[PDB]
Amino acid sequence: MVKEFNTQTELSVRLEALWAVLSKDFITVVPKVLPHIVKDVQLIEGDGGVGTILIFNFLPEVSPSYQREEITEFDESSHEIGLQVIEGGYLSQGLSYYKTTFKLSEIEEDKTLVNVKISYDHVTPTKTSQSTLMYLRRLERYLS
Ligand SMILES: C/C(=C\CNc1ncnc2[nH]cnc12)CO
Numbered sequence: 001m002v003k004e005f006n007t008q009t010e011l012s013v014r015l016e017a018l019w020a021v022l023s024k025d026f027i028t029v030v031p032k033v034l035p036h037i038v039k040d041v042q043l044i045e046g047d048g049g050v051g052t053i054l055i056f057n058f059l060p061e062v063s064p065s066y067q068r069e070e071i072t073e074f075d076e077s078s079h080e081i082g083l084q085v086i087e088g089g090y091l092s093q094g095l096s097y098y099k100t101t102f103k104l105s106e107i108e109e110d111k112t113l114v115n116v117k118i119s120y121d122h123v124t125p126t127k128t129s130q131s132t133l134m135y136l137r138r139l140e141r142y143l144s
């Protein structure tokens with residue numbers, strides 16, 4: 001059955017700057033901040049927001065060589081974005097279901113809380129969450 005893993009991190013960045021890169025401007029950023037993992041990101045379908053489909057192409061040494069993700073939730077007013085893996089990635093490594101939901105909140109002008117919810121069924125969320133948190137901290141440094 002689908003289980004959940006929740007974690008969070010506070011980043012030293014403005015909410016709106018983090019929201020823009022997280023939710024919309026990530027296509028050139030992911031390969032720049034995860035160059036050991038992601039070769040490029042392709043927009044497959046959609047124009048942003050719900051129903052958008054993405055391909056993440058990994059480095060040649062990586063198997064599976066890609067992951068297909070879909071934006072399943074998008075809410076500007078609450079700064080929430082959810083992405084479901086629909087092909088490849090962790091689904092090729094024993095997961096039957098995998099979704100990541102990010103929610104941003106303002107703590108102070110230059111401090112933003114990121115809540116991370118991973119929904120999964122069957123590679124553990126303890127480990128996969130570390131990768132997701134590393135990505136978030138990399139967005140903080142990109143923006144700083
Ligand atoms: C494009 C975005 C995230 C890309 N997807 C993932 N980003 C970070 N950790 C993950 N684990 C599985 N899928 C992901 C939001 O900027």
Ligand SMILES: C/C(=C\CNc1ncnc2[nH]cnc12)CO
Binds near residue numbers: 024043047048
């Ligand atoms: C539709 C989205 C972004 C629009 N920007 C890009 N859309 C498509 N290809 C790209 N290459 C670099 N930036 C882009 C994701 O919200």
Ligand SMILES: C/C(=C\CNc1ncnc2[nH]cnc12)CO
Binds near residue numbers: 038058089131132
């Ligand atoms: C299953 C694999 C990678 C999992 N996906 C991700 N792993 C780490 N950071 C990411 N950003 C976007 N997608 C990812 C390839 O071994």
